[PDB]
């Protein structure tokens, strides 16, 4: 029948829920209750980066942990030397509206994308000193939400349709297409082992894919509202998820189950960016109420507040060496907290 | 000094970049970003091409440039996205105006146009952003009301209980029974406009035909009023 297999799907959902419950023996609080607190954490804006004209949406640290590319609505990607507060490059974009910004691990390319349905790849290191667009990846029928670099020749893009796409830059065509979402994907994070990646969509669900055949491994559904941020644990076997429920949820891949929820009573604003620390103990989430919160990833305790911002905090990213965390807000300000 | 020669030259490069940023900040502040929305039948694509005389396959944003009285605008049309606009529309929290174009020729699916306008109006991000509503292709409405094939009362029951508004200023050459339906649509949209306006934003109704030989001066005046109210809000107390 047309509705016959719906019952089978519901039975499978009940079976996976029962499996998750069976694997659920003790919560993370019950296991980490005997661990000393991280203490009261204070960080100050060591360097604030001025120069953007409009709201900053996206940022991404480089591998060297010194160069920082930031994307703003004026149509500009500025590359900052965070140590000296300089501007290495000021790339002017074709489309003023940009949602995502990436920085390749080799430091040769920066990827931008937005409501133009185009992932533009800019070659930083060229014989001519000007940064020229390498290639304009096209084939997405929706706004690009998160572009991330695998290597110098591959790039994973999560867009405004219910699809993610892995592109080979040289050929210019979609190497593979990941489908299975029923809403627009808004964030994307790649595992450290450059083999898996989790995508968070507006379905209140985060799906873990595998970039070798293009089929999803597991799906995690614990949220109520849409998902705006996602970030793997440094270990690579857990990932965080930021939503508009004013809750940040840490899931684990091996147990296929919710691990912990971070949500305080006086927080009713959504989360725009989530990033783990190098040790994974600090989960930094930039909320809509003009500030950021540094949760203890193993105690669900608000163990730090980062204050200075005049508008909505949009992007938030830690360095590879864990020295500093950079938060870019809608008031054209990047702040490097340490 | 205290820093090497290469760092001096890097600081000079940063200064040049900041100079370019200062130069194009003037262009950014002078230009008034405008959002453009409407259904498929609404002739926004026709407008954004008919105003050009006086002044990629799956691309998302189409940009139109035009200046009136040495004041330059930037209209953005969203063309290749999904039905759910809940997420990307927050990128237009700082646009000067929203131009909602409604096809008044077709009587069916006017209720869904009303619903779309209501969703635009009550959006959290779109609060404090006004709307320059354009009831486009009035020529087709005038032709159809004289055609006699279709009736307003079939789709809307309150038309019979609606006399012409006293503030109407129609051209005397048109049939006085046409302006009844012509202003009924405006009243229907203005009820949604005034339901929850409350002073942060207002709707600016207009009637636009196919070409009209001019459509940018209305936007000029309306945006002047919008920016004037925005500036006055700094003294409002």
């Amino acid at each position, epitope marked *: 029948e047309l509705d016959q297999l719906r019952q089978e799907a519901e039975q499978l959902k009940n079976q996976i829920r029962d499996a998750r419950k069976a694997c659920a023996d003790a919560t993370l609080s019950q296991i980490t209750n005997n661990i000393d607190p991280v203490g009261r954490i204070q960080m100050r804006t060591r360097r604030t980066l001025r120069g953007h004209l409009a709201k900053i949406y996206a940022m991404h640290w480089g591998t060297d942990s010194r160069l920082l590319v930031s994307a703003s609505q004026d149509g500009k990607l500025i590359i900052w030397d965070s140590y000296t507060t300089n501007k290495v490059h000021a790339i002017p974009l074709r489309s003023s509206w940009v949602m995502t910004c990436a920085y390749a691990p080799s430091g040769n390319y920066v990827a931008c994308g937005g409501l133009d349905n185009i992932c533009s790849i800019y070659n930083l290191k060229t*014989r001519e*000193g000007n940064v020229r667009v390498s290639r304009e990846l096209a084939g997405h029928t929706g706004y690009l939400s998160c572009c991330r670099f695998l290597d110098d020749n591959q790039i994973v893009t999560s867009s405004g349709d219910t699809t993610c796409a892995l592109w080979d830059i040289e050929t210019g065509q979609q190497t593979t297409t990941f489908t299975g979402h029923t809403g627009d994907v808004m964030s994307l994070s790649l595992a450290p082992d450059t083999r898996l990646f989790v995508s968070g969509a507006c379905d209140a669900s985060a799906k873990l894919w595998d970039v070798r055949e293009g089929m999803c491994r597991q799906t995690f559904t614990g949220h109520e509202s849409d998902i705006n941020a996602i970030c793997f644990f440094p270990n690579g076997n857990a990932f965080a998820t930021g939503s508009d429920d004013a809750t940040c949820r840490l899931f684990d891949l091996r147990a296929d189950q919710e691990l912990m929820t971070y949500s305080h009573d006086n927080i009713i604003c959504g989360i725009t960016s989530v990033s783990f620390s190098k040790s994974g103990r600090l989960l930094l989430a930039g909320y809509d109420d003009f500030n950021c919160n540094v949760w203890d990833a193993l105690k669900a305790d608000r163990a730090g507040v980062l204050a200075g911002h005049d508008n909505r905090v949009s992007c938030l990213g830690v360095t590879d060496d864990g020295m500093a965390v950079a938060t870019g807000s809608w008031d054209s300000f990047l702040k490097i907290w340490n | 000094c205290t820093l090497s020669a*290469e760092d001096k030259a890097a600081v000079e490069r940063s200064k040049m970049i900041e100079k370019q940023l200062q130069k194009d900040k003037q262009v950014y502040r002078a230009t008034h970003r405008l959002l453009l929305l409407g259904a498929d039948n609404s002739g926004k694509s026709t407008i954004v091409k008919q105003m050009r005389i006086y002044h990629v396959k799956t691309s998302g944003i189409f940009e139109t440039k035009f200046q009136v009285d040495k004041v330059n605008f930037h209209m953005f049309d969203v063309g290749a996205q999904r039905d759910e606009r809940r997420k990307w529309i927050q990128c237009f929290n700082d646009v000067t105006a929203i131009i909602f174009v409604v096809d008044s020729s077709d009587y069916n699916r006017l209720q869904e146009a009303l619903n779309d306008f209501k969703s635009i109006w009550n959006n959290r991000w779109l609060r404090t952003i006004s709307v320059i509503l354009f009831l486009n292709k009035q020529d087709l409405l005038a032709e159809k009301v004289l055609a006699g094939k279709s009736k307003i009362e079939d789709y809307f029951p309150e038309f019979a209980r609606y006399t012409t508004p006293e503030d109407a200023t129609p051209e005397p050459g048109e049939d006085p029974r046409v302006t009844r339906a012509k202003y009924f649509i405006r009243d229907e949209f203005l009820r949604i406009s005034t339901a929850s306006g409350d002073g942060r934003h207002y709707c600016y109704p207009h009637f636009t035909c196919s070409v009209d030989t001019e459509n940018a001066r209305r936007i000029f005046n309306d945006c002047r009023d919008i920016i004037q109210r925005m500036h006055l809000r700094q003294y409002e107390l």
Partner: single-chain antibody
Amino acid sequence: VQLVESGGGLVQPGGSRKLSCSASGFAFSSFGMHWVRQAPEKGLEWVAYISSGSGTIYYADTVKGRFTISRDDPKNTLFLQMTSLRSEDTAMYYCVRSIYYYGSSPFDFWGQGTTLTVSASADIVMTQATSSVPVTPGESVSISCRSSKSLLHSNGNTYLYWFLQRPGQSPQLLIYRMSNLASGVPDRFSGSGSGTAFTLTISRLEAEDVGVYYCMQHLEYPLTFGAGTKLEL
């Protein structure tokens, strides 16, 4: 990218001469320009430098007032006026490209050069070995240089540059900051230093590596070159 120079020839002493460098193939606006002399038999010596925007102009002590530099950006050209050209100026001139930011590689491209012949100071002096090192192909060369001042700035960069000049074209960059390799040179080259003494090691010698190897410091202006160490086959 190419940098073609116009000028040069026989000039009487005390005269004036205008030399131009036309840059075709790259963004001339974002790049600093340098002028480098080379005597008919001796080595190199820095002359003048103009930055992006003509806002930071430097000269060597020996050319402090005699020469003046000027960049015309719209047509992508760099001129210099030479006043009171004495016999000490009978050197070939090179229009050297440069760019400065984090990770940048200054002194990338060198123009072919024009021959200008004239008829009849706490600088960081850099010293190399004798300009005669007998090396055969397939072996490892261990050129060495010494600096009068430690080039390790507080940043962590030793502003050292090693260049190669074949008997033909203009010198090309091999390594910058004593460790970083140039864009096009092979991986056979390497550089190791401690702040005062530096070594350029070629782990494998080929027939195209014959030439004269030149040193550079960049801690502070003026820029001192050194005599140069020559490899012979």
